[PDB]
Amino acid sequence: QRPERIKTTPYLEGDVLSSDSGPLLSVFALQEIMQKVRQVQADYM
């Protein structure tokens, strides 16, 4: 079920921070790149 996800020792078992997905990041990526440009062009001459 969990091939390599098998956690043998507690050392790897930590807490959960956040989580991401394909459609999540794909959007985020674009967003960031678009802010980039507006923020510069709109910012300078």
């Binding site: 091939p3 098998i6 043998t8 020792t9 507690p10 050392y11 790897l12 078992e13």
Partner: protein, 845 residues
């Protein structure tokens, strides 16, 4: 004066509860290993092995692609063995016949009853003779008297009974004696009075003891654990650590020496300062603990705050530290960094010179303490930090690592006697802190005057006693008190210092206790008199052994599970190492894991580190241990586990016998079975892989192929997977599910246009015995039918489960020796006796 250790301890409690796990069962009659099933006939009947019936349904179905499941299924089965097999006999049912002790039929493994009502007069009587023929041998074994008889029992199980008994025997002579004596030594060394009361009984003379743990332990198993270092330390202290109090010196000592000339003010204007507890005292506890470890926990760097200026505080600590801690060439107490800062704080205190000058002969190296202070010129280069030497700081030209050879544990029985204080006796401290040199302390006092202050060095002369007692106290605690399988081994002890110097790193990690600059002074004005020892001490050794044995049991399990892959590949193809021990960890005690996790959730262990540990030959034997070990042995047959590779399908007729002489059916009522006496000729079998079946079905040839093979009488055998075996008995024509149940599934589904197919191989296989029951109204014809009735599944196991038996042939099975303790003698496990003792108090002041 009130520190404990939660959450790492609530575990010690359930480990203590582990000692209670009773792994054996005491009975007066062994479980039946042989049942007799009655066909209609007085001549012959059939015997059953029971064991196999039980072993039939033990674990889950053995499915491929589920390695974890598989492992556990096995574990359960192995565990099942040592379970069913561990039992001791006591107060057996004897009978009297012609002045001889005969065994009562119920005490042998076997059931007649069923049979009794049928058998002819002659047969009956014959058996009666065999019964009063089973006599009981007397005396012998373990100096005390035991009854011996020959009763029957199932192979694998009997092996366990045997081993169990053998262990009890060992205990009775050798092992008990050892364990007790070991304690007497440990109670001498650690000052613990041990209860002998248990054997003081009176009826003792005839009491069999069942100590199930053994005491010498074996340091190895505990330290064989990967990265255990830290976890074991925690353990040592959590176990072996006393609760005490920090005593203060005489208020007068300073008042007369230091605070003497009112108008000096000096660096010791610091004396007035009381303690900011929260930070300070915990910092003093740290310094004490760390120093009483000693090289395990270092008195690392000294924190950072801007209070680091305060020249009085700094200088003061500089002196204090050269007498409080060991930079000793035998072992270390502090960080290289911590020391350097100390030497500097000291260097400044020296060439501080608020009063009349001396002679300051600076050296070639600008290095702090390269100056000889005049008159006699005591060059303070000898008060520098050379770890490999000890040179300045405490110890120095002293011996602290000595070896009083015989001592418990063999955890290299060394002894740290701080500043030569061979503290083997009860301290005062009103006396003992008399004419005691330290050399380092002594030379400190010379340099202290040759350089400057007498008023300050006089406070140090008056301090000697109180300082010698803090240390004498420590020695007893370190050396005498915390001497357990949890305190570190010596080859490592000796490796701490040099590895620290080298900088290079290995498993054996120093603990980082950051300290307050000011706490140094407070520690010098606080000796340690332990008010009362930890309550775990007397029980500790038992607990130690519990952990130890539990570990080895795990190792063992894994040793066998590991090879399971090369053993049965077709079953565990997807198997990866992680799988098999996750299953071990799963079926093993949680408390034990907890102990390991202390350093595993910190250090990280690789499958490789685990294998090494498994393969390490060092096991502390217990009752549990030997039994599991032996269970695994018997459990290597696998036919003995009730899961076999041998399952074929073949067009087979159901025996339809003639019935002319109905009376002749006093025969074995033609039982019939799938159970093949032996497997087929390989050249007649057709080995099927999913792979081939795919192809055949891909050409719409699958069904056809099978048909032809069957029509050819030839046998086919799918897979090579294990498959769980089931066993059922029938009184008449079984369900078509059993008769014509095919060991595979084949379906065709049309989707889109494509059309897909699915082929699955069975995991369950049923062996059955169809007993033929007939009556007088029956015709010889009656059992024959125009067309045959077919049976496809046939299995093979070279393990005699069910078999045709005569009658006089019943008692045959008696081939197994048995030992049973006299009912008038007493048996009792005194495994719990090992925690009975008392912490021997201190004289107090």
């Amino acid at each position: 004066v009130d520190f404990t250790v939660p959450d790492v301890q609530q575990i010690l409690d359930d480990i203590k509860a582990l000692a209670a796990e009773q792994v054996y069962k005491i009975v007066k009659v062994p479980s039946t290993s042989f049942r007799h099933i009655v066909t209609q006939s007085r001549d012959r009947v059939l015997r059953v092995d029971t064991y196999y019936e039980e072993m039939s349904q033990v674990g889950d179905v053995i499915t491929e692609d589920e390695p974890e499941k598989f492992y556990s299924t096995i574990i359960k089965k192995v565990r099942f063995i040592r379970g069913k097999g561990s039992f001791i006999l006591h107060d057996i049912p004897a009978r009297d016949h012609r002045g001889m002790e005969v065994a009562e039929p119920e005490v042998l493994g076997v059931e007649f009853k069923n049979v009794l009502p049928v058998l002819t007069a002659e047969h009956r009587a014959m058996i009666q003779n065999a019964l009063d023929g089973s006599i009981i041998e007397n005396g012998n074994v373990a100096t005390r008297d035991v009854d011996v008889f020959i009763g029957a029992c199932s192979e694998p199980i009997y092996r366990i009974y045997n081993r169990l008994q053998g262990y009890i025997e060992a205990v009775q002579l050798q092992e008990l004696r050892n364990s007790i004596g070991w304690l007497e030594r440990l109670g001498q060394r650690k000052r613990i009075t041990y209860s002998q009361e248990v054997l003081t009984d009176f009826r003792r003379q005839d009491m069999i003891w069942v100590l199930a743990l053994q005491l010498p332990v074996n340091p190895q198993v505990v330290w064989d654990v990967p990265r255990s270092s830290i976890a074991n330390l925690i353990m040592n202290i959590a176990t072996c650590l006393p609760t005490g109090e920090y005593i203060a010196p005489n208020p007068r000592i300073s008042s007369i020496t230091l605070t003497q000339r009112i108008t000096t003010t000096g660096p010791f204007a610091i004396l007035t300062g009381s303690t900011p507890t929260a930070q300070q005292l915990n910092d003093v506890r740290k310094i004490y603990l760390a120093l009483m470890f000693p090289g395990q926990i270092i008195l690392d760097l000294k924190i950072d705050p801007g209070e680091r200026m305060d020249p009085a505080v700094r200088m003061v600590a500089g002196v204090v530290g050269h007498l409080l801690f060991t930079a000793g060439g035998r072992f270390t107490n502090l960080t290289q960094n911590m020391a350097r800062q100390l030497d500097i704080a000291l260097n400044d205190y020296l060439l501080y010179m608020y009063n009349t000058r001396v002679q300051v002969n600076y050296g070639p190296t600008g290095e702090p303490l390269d100056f000889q202070i005049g008159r006699n010129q005591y060059d303070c280069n000898v008060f520098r930090a050379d770890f490999a030497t000890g040179t300045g700081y405490n110890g120095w030209a002293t011996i602290d690592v000595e070896y009083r050879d015989p001592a418990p544990y063999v955890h290299a029985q060394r002894y740290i006697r701080y500043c030569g204080i061979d503290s083997r006796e009860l301290i005062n401290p009103t006396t003992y802190g008399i004419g005691m040199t330290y050399h380092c302390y002594n030379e400190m006092l010379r340099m202290l005057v040759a350089a400057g202050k007498d008023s300050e060095a006089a406070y140090f002369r008056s301090m000697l006693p109180f300082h010698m007692v803090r240390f004498a106290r420590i020695n007893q605690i370190i050396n005498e008190d915390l001497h357990s399988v949890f305190s570190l081994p010596d080859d490592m002890f000796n490796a701490l210092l040099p590895d620290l110097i080298a900088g290079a790193h290995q498993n054996a990690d120093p603990v980082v206790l950051d300290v307050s600059w000011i706490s140094l002074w407070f520690a010098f004005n606080r000796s340690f008199e332990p008010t009362h020892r930890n309550e775990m001490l007397e029980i500790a050794p038992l607990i130690e052994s519990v952990y130890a044995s539990e570990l080895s049991v795990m190792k063992v399990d894994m040793r066998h599970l590991s090879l399971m892959q090369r053993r049965f590949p077709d079953v565990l193809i997807q198997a990866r190492p992680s799988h098999f021990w996750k299953a071990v960890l799963n079926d093993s005690p949680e408390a034990v894991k907890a102990v390991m996790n202390l350093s595993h959730s910190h250090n990280f262990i690789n499958i490789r580190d685990m294998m090494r540990w498994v393969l390490l030959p060092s096991l502390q034997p217990s009752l549990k241990l030997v039994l599991e070990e032996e269970a695994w042995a018997a459990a290597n047959d696998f036919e003995d586990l009730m899961l076999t590779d041998q399952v074929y399908m073949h067009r087979d007729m159901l025996p339809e016998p003639r019935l002319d002489d109905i009376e002749r059916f006093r025969q074995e009522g033609f039982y019939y079975t799938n159970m093949l006496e032996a497997p087929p000729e390989i050249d007649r079998v057709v080995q099927y892989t999913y792979e081939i079946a795919r192809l055949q079905a891909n050409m719409g040839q699958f069904r056809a192929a099978l048909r032809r093979i069957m029509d050819d009488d030839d046998w086919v055998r799918f897979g090579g997977v294990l498959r769980t075996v089931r066993v059922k008995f029938f009184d008449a024509r079984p369900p078509d599910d059993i008769l014509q149940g095919l060991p595979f599934s084949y379906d065709t589904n049309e989707k889109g246009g494509l059309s897909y197919a699915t082929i699955k191989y069975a995991t369950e296989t049923t062996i059955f015995y169809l007993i033929y029951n007939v009556e007088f109204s029956n015709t010889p014809d009656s059992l024959v039918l125009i067309n045959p009735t077919y049976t496809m599944t046939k299995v093979f196991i070279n393990k005699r489960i069910v078999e045709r038996v005569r009658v006089g042939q019943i008692l045959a099975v008696l081939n197994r020796r048995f030992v049973a303790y006299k009912g008038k003698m007493r048996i009792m496990d005194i495994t719990q006796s090992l925690k009975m003792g008392t912490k021997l108090a201190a004289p107090t002041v």
